[model samples]
Target: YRYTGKLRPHYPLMPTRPVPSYIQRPDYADHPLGMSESEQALKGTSQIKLLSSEDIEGMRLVCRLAREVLDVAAGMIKPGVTTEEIDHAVHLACIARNCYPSPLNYYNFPKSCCTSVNEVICHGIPDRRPLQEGDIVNVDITLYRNGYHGDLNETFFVGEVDDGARKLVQTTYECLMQAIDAVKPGVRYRELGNIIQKHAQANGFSVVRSYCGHGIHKLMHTAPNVPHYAKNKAVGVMKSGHVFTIEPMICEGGWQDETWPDGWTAVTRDGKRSAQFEHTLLVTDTGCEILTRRLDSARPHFMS
Candidate 1:
């Protein structure tokens, strides 16, 4: 059937579920009338928040737990499984670890995790539609544990995927690693956009511009706004103990994106497939460390 046409969003999304009262939550958990004070206080302080030894250890644990949750959710990707089912599994997986699902109610985002399907670049809410064969979906997961948050996501094949989809996902991952490889103390954060954009454009893809990576540790999103496009004016220098994410959302179409009526989902205006990969990182004196790196047994299924 060689389908390269517009992929539409599935409707009638499941309502947002309430977090168990027993679970610990970030200050923004209730979708309050105003921004949480903790988040507000963290903003406008510094672009880079240096991590202490205690902070780094907390990040390491939470990042490992996020990887485990993502691995478990991804293993259930089959033709008949609903994104809602995956969300439920992820929610349970977080609670089992005594961690809070970072996305749950953060800034009023309804889902515990994001399930962005084909043509949907990011923040696609989980719904009842069963993913079809040959489709590729990106599962973005983050968990808050020990006062720190760990974030990571990977695009996975629903069943058998075509070569084009494979290349997009693989290249997206490469873009992320290449950018990470460039990270070291004294490097300019703006250089990351150059590295990411060069790789993405070289492979016939466009870098998403609407949402960039951020300085994350105690806050879900904070300083050091990282734009994944060339000539971006993002300002900051990598310093030891600084942690952030380098998630490049590469698209098979134009770099421009449009949001669904839901106000959360972002998709390519040209209706082409998109793929993304992310990792939380720690800036070391020599270079950076990938906090959310997978174990040997949990690497990507589609690519070795």
Candidate 2:
């Protein structure tokens, strides 16, 4: 496969780890192509689901589990560690809690969690390559528990990243937080893009437009497609009980993205660094609740 950046595919992924029959599975878990039937059916309707209190509770519980799993994966990040090791940790952590790694078979993604390193914008499959000292990688995690899905990720310093990489990662984090602060009933879904775009531009970065934040629940992806660029036509206004993810892929050079031959891993067309941060949020009457808020254990020691 042709590559445009320094990151290359380190193939020969581990065999897909099997999930026990006792654990809950998404509709695509066993499907050959990993086509999610629920998500497919839901995609036909543009209406966003307004979750009930019970569904919100499920999101809370699952999001907590996802946060904990992400920590297990993040804690393993170091100069010599391979993304495959992090994926293995994520797989075990999920099944141990009886939750399926939501991305496992979804769209036939071979790995448990996505490890997008350097120029890879998103969905960079985990591989055997050892992370380098100056590199940064975004570990995207999603877990399905009790028929609900929780998604979150953060960009991490491999050991010590350069100033540009550090700023890109931290700015991406702030973009997500600032957008989250704007979440509340009556806010338009489109408003998030401007907030994210503004922050990234002010920091001399660009927003990746190809991928977007999405509605998450029983279906891995749902309605109310949230974009991260300015003046986009994302529909609907936030309502209490609206649940979705606002993952902004901010790049150091250009916002353009190109997908790998794997057809899943997206990378920057300019071959410059990209970083992202994400959280599944629930709109409350007053504001939004960050369901995947980092616990004291999950907070990054390096960010200090």
Report the lDDT tens digits of candidate 2 across residue range 1-304: 6677888988788888888899988889899999987788777677989898899989999999999998888788899899998899899999998899999988888888999999998998999899999999999999999999999998899887789987898889889889999999999999999999999999999999989999998888889899999999998999998999999999999999999988899999889999999999999889999999987854553485
Model 1 clash pairs are: none
lDDT of 1: 0.87
Estimated TM-score per prediction? 0.94, 0.97
Predictions in order: lDDT: 0.87, 0.90
TM-score of structure candidate 2: 0.97
Candidate whose lDDT is highest: 2
Give me the runs in candidate 2 sitting further than 4 Å from their true place.
297-302
Candidate 1: where are CA atoms >4 Å away? 1-11, 44-46
